[PDB]
């Protein structure tokens, strides 16, 4: 809407106070005009209607526990694009600040979040699987993440290809957790999950066979559930992108992390410039490889650690 930009302040799902980019016109909206062309939250009411309605509030005060799926949608939709923008010179995610448009309350006992092509939707969860999903900067930055993904590699939602665009999803979902650095960790989804289990999450990147996913291309799933494991064998790549930050020796295969930030650097390249929409992992490798190349060199660390990685993975 046409008005006049302003700051609220509300509680996110977790009890946390922060600020939020506003705008005036007889209500305050969540619409953010100081990023891109604008970031815009919607209330959809506990239906399935998309977008629903934009979200207006009389006094710029986000308090009340109907607000705060709205208010850390908003947010950690912002956090992501400063991410994007100040790390890799991304605006938006198709590059040209395209308007980011997000809707909370999403049906009823909702156990999910997700890009549908066009926007962010976010379940509120039962109350026992998930509390409302906004709440995970890491969930944010992953859906959103896939907007990315479609918009440069158009990585294909099946088999291989599909869990390297759920595995880049992942990636950079926890890169933007370590950006916000509030409790950061390479697991998924854990601040929204299970609110009366302690220590667990959807999925784990350091060690995916800690919640039953493949860490070895042997262990590959081969069957048709999840679109071909997309939400499966991702957690062989996503074991690969642990070891080039962090290092290890995982099935005796010894990897030199080189840190977060190469990493990242390193993944944005394939994904605008080499993945395609049918890449397979050994095309990744590949692709990885080559990014690391031209980045840091031929015969860098950063490209000799890519190979070690996805040799401790079994990929070739
Ligand atoms: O895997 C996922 N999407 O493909 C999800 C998205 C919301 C929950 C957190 C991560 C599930
Ligand atoms: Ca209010
Ligand atoms: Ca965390
Ligand atoms: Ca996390
Ligand atoms: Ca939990
Ligand atoms: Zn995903």
Known sequence: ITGTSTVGVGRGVLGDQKNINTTYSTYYYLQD????????????????????????????????????????????????????????????????????????????????????????????????????????????????????????????????????????????????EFYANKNPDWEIGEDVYTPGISGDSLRSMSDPAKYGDPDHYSKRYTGTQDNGGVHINSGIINKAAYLISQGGTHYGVSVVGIGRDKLGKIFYRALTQYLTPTSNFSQLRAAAVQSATDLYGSTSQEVASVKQAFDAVGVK
């Open 33 to 176: 005009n100081t990023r891109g062309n604008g970031i815009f939250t919607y209330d959809a009411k506990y239906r399935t209607t998309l977008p629903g309605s934009l979200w207006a509030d009389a006094d710029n005060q986000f308090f009340a526990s109907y607000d705060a799926p709205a208010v850390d949608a908003h947010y950690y939709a912002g956090v992501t694009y400063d991410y994007y923008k100040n790390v890799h010179n991304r605006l938006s995610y198709d590059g040209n600040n395209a308007a980011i448009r997000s809707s909370v309350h999403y049906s009823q006992g909702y156990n999910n979040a997700f890009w549908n092509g066009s926007q962010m939707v976010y379940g509120d969860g039962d109350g026992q699987t998930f509390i409302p999903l906004s709440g995970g900067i890491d969930v944010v930055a992953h859906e959103l993440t896939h907007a990315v993904t479609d918009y440069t590699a158009g990585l294909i939602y099946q088999n291989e290809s599909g869990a390297i665009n759920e595995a880049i999803s992942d990636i950079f979902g926890t890169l933007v």
